[PDB]
Design a protein around this nucleic acid. Structure first.
Lengths: 94, 71, 110, 67
RNA sequence: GCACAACCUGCGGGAACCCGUACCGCAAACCGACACAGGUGGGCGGGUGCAAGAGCACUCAGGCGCGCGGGAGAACCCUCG
RNA sequence: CAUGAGUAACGAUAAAGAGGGUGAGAAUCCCUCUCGCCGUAAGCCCAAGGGUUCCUACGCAAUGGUCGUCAGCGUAGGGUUAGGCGGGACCUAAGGUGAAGCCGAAAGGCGUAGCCGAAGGGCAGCCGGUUAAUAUUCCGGCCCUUCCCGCAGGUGCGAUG
RNA sequence: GAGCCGGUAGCGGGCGUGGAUCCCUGGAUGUCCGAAUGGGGGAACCCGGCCGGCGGGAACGCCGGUCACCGCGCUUUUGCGCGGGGGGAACCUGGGGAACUGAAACAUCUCAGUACCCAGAGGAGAGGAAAGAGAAAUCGACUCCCUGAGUAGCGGCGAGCGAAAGGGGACCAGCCUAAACCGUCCGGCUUGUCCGGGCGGGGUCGUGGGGCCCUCGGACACCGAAUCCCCAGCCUAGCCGAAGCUGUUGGGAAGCAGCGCCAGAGAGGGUGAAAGCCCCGUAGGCGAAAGGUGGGGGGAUAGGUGAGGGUACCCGAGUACCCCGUGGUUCGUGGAGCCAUGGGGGAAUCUGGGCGGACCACCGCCUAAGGCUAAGUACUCCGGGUGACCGAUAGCGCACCAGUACCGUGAGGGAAAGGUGAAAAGAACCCCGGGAGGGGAGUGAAAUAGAGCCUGAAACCGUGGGCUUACAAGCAGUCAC
């Protein structure tokens, strides 16, 4: 309770280009306030929170032998930089 | 509840009927009237000390009001 | 054959079997006594995968089932297992003692 | 790391505070890892979580003792 | 209270979160237990011609070709001359 | 599990014919070329309601009223983000609730006030460009919105009765 | 006691005899909904006001601690400090309370105070020390069982319905308060001498209590948890624990055979086909803990009980009682009693007053119009065990991803499917093929044991073989040949 962390980067393709020049996209604690995004963002990666937007998605179509389901809840949020800093290794990475 | 008495309980039941008589007169009982009903008292009031009421119910009333009249 | 057991890594005999030739009990569960005596398996003529040689057929088959194995063997083979008399300050020593004896002392061998 | 049980015993207010916080961050590191080293990681994840968990068990014990 | 730091008004600076879009959607995805010709709300409804016009006939864009095929084609119900 | 039955039936008399292609197999998939029927709809559009699916990639034994290398089918992965669009962060009627109050054998009946409660009120952006895929949400050009800190100028300012 | 990262075994990585898996008892956050209560709201999601915090400060926004309502008593000013509420298969008390069907119609009647709506206390409540019984100069709380008669009786005396004291049994504490009188006291009004409310002695058990006079009196009684300490019964973990091998037919043996074996423990299951001596911490007996629960046995804690006569009396209920209007009860209207209440009347302090006999004269009875609770019959969610109780269409419907699929708007209805084998060794590999699937090799004791795969029959369709059949009218057949 108060363990700041609240996310998992958007290893997502399309989301790549943004990482590429100025914005970055990730999966975030389905719940964090957008200002929550700004803070986790800022103190976490020592940056400059710019433009913080959000989207959400649940799962559809998972057949399980004799019964079925479709998954849980994956949350999406995108935040941009001010200069183009931080996330380096992550980005060079994927 | 919202209409029993105030000075005890007098709010309820009643099964009854009749038909007719003619017994130790000339015969048996013209027997029958499978009926059901209510059965109760009345309302009224006085004053604590400038500004009041009572509400209550009938008799129990009269004696009572007399009582707290004593105080 | 329950939440409780017989020998463990131990080293014991096969009565009603096909081998009897006792030896290293490579592993033994808690509930299904499921124990492998490394005494009779097969090949599972493997996947056809490169999992096993790209030209496969697994070798060491050894899941030991039946429980007629005569666990424990001191200078004596088929023997039940005793318990204790403690003898020393805080002494469980549920070692195995009957006729000959074996307790699997933490030394020279299991 | 019963030993860690010990360190635990050892620290207090702001201490345990930033300890569990930073450690937590560490596990974040893990979160990140969700697609890199991985293999020997496993444990950093499960255990690390158990660890920090303890961290909290303690804070509770101590400040609870308090108020 | 204000009135010396309340409101009206410029410039600078700084802020602004929660849930929402995909696509189907006069319809095989919405309602009739079916890829059921039934019903289901508002937006000009392109054009030519017709006195007028969302009716008429051919079309603009845009949309199809209904989803089981080929075959001779007599009875006879259907539809129509 | 049989039976009429391998006859009745394929969901609209808005017709289709070719060439080449891909395929284990293509009347029934793909391009392209002839051709008919819509067009005032078989248009697009917002909304409702559906809630997968949409896409991209593999696959078809089930499913389509046979096909079927096609799919809204199966398997996997990715896909919608908006101070200014919408709704709440505001308003309220019918209307529900309901502190009061009147009221029932009990459970309730009735109910001002305040509240909840609407494509009925009110409110600050538009257009051109970019994805397999979403847009006035993204990019860009252009036009603003209130609220906070300040400062600068200006005032009996200061309810929501 | 030495192995585990639940049902997944697989991948990819691990912790542990410096008690790791895990069995138990108490621990910590303990998301959002749900009584919800800070507010709203189509619950499980959106709002807000106070102190703390961090960040880009203010605005933003999260952790956080935060803030219904009720009635309840306390300092009228804490509105501080409590209570409840919300449940629950059946049992349970009271509240309100029905047609069928019977009476072969059916209106009294009947099912019945039964079904059901409700409110509510529990772990069990219910009732529970007599204005009782009953008539013997008798009993003695209440509750539940057997009996009491299905008589005594209730009634279109019809269908029907149907007691109670006693006796046998079981389980056996009894205890209390306003009850003006005492005095005390504070408030009173208004002052003297009334009421009001606190302490008491009185605080009626089968009848006194108080105040005056005298005999009085100087250690055994515990509660309904008064209360506390214990062997706390268990909770779930514990522990031991009886005796065979050789052979042998078998894929097997625990089986046929040989000899040797146990037994305060031949209950059963489990170990490749039927073991006392093989598996089982069982019957044998014993085991055990610092938590969560108490009856016992005993202690202490023991409120409070526990004397005698005398004397003008004042001291348990606001309605007893009587008229009609009604409930109970074996009572349905009746000669109809007692308790019980809706109307109007409308009082007695132990010469008191209801009760036995409608009522009157008797004797007798009990002591009413307040309070408390144990113990013996009920009930079944949940645990344990036993079954001339069931085998997968019976059993709970439900034997295991059945109260879910799926129909209905909601209310609501409400399936099916158990087994491959002994163990996975469950199918490398070669061959037709797009695939499935098909022939081989290996499996093996069998694979006509092959994955819906044990035993696997009837029905129906199929491949081959025998007899039979184109001038035939007949369920069928069937006797004959």
């Amino acid at each position: 309770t108060a363990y700041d962390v609240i996310l998992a980067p958007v290893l997502s393709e399309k989301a790549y280009a943004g990482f590429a020049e100025g914005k970055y996209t990730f999966w975030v604690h389905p719940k964090a306030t957008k200002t929550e995004i700004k803070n986790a963002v800022e103190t976490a990666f020592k940056v400059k929170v710019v433009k913080v937007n959000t989207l959400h998605v649940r799962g559809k179509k998972k057949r399980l032998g004799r019964y079925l389901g479709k998954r849980p809840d994956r949350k999406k949020a995108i935040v941009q930089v001010a200069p183009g800093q931080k996330i380096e290794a992550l980005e060079g990475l994927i | 509840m919202k209409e029993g008495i105030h000075p005890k309980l007098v709010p309820a039941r009643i099964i009854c009927g009749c038909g007719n008589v003619i017994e130790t007169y000339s015969t048996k009982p013209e027997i029958y009237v499978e009926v059901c009903s209510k059965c109760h008292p009345f309302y009224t009031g006085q004053q604590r000390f400038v500004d009041t009421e009572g509400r209550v119910e009938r008799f129990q009333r009269r004696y009572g009001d007399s009582y707290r009249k004593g105080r | 054959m329950r939440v409780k057991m017989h020998v463990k890594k131990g080293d014991t005999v096969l009565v009603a079997s096909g081998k009897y030739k006792g030896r290293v009990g490579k592993v033994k569960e808690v509930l299904p006594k499921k124990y492998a005596v490394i005494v009779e398996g097969v090949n599972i003529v493997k996947k056809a995968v490169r999992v096993s040689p790209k030209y496969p057929q697994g070798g060491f088959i050894e899941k030991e089932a039946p429980l007629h194995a005569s666990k424990v063997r001191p200078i004596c083979p088929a023997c039940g297992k005793p318990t204790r008399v403690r003898k020393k300050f805080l002494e469980n020593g549920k070692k195995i003692r009957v006729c000959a004896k074996c307790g699997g002392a933490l030394d020279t061998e299991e | 790391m019963r030993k860690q049980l010990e360190e635990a015993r050892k620290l207090s207010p702001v201490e345990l505070e930033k300890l569990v916080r930073e450690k937590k961050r560490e596990l974040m590191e893990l979160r990140f890892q969700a697609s890199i080293g991985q293999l020997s990681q496993n444990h950093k994840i499960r255990d690390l979580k158990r660890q920090i968990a303890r961290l909290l068990t303690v804070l509770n014990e101590k400040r609870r003792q308090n108020a």
